[PDB]
Copies of this chain bind each other. A is one copy, B any other.
């Protein structure tokens, strides 16, 4: 399988 996820939360 293949998975790609990106998360760049800012405050």
Contacts and interface: CB of A to CB of B under 8 A. Distances in A.
One complex includes copies of this chain to the number of: 8
A11 B6 contact: no
Interface residues of A, number: 11
A8 to B, nearest CB: 5
Nearest to A1: B10
B7 A2 contact: no
B1 A11 contact: yes
A10 B5 contact: no
A6 B2 CA distance: 14
A5 B8 contact: yes
A6 to B, nearest CB: 4
A1 B9 CA distance: 9
